Amino acid sequence: GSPIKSRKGDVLHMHYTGKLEDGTEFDSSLPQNQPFVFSLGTGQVIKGWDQGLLGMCEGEKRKLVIPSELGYGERGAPPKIPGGATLVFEVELLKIERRT
DSSP: OOOOOOOTTOEEEEEEEEEOTTSOEEEESTTTTOOEEEETTSSSSOHHHHHHSTTOOTTOEEEEEEOGGGTTTTTOBTTTBOTTOOEEEEEEEEEEGGGO
16 A cells, blocks of 8 residues: 655645644634645645645644744734734645545
8 A cells, every 4th residue: 555645736625723822723624524625735725834734644633833924924814813823733634636
């Protein structure tokens, strides 16, 4: 066997829980139990995700600390995300479309 792993261009189905530095969860795909689906490496998601989610196999978890320069910047993303907030994501890759 040779598990495929995420590369630029893949379509990923991703669970995430994002937290502030204050520990407080701002968002998660887990409560609705709805994976976020997107094309990796296309500027569809935050820069910290595009550079940070490479080389994941299905079923693998990763933690990403993402200072605001690589997230939503000083602008922020109201209501949940303050301008300048460092985000802490715990992500779980569920599915890479390419393998099937």
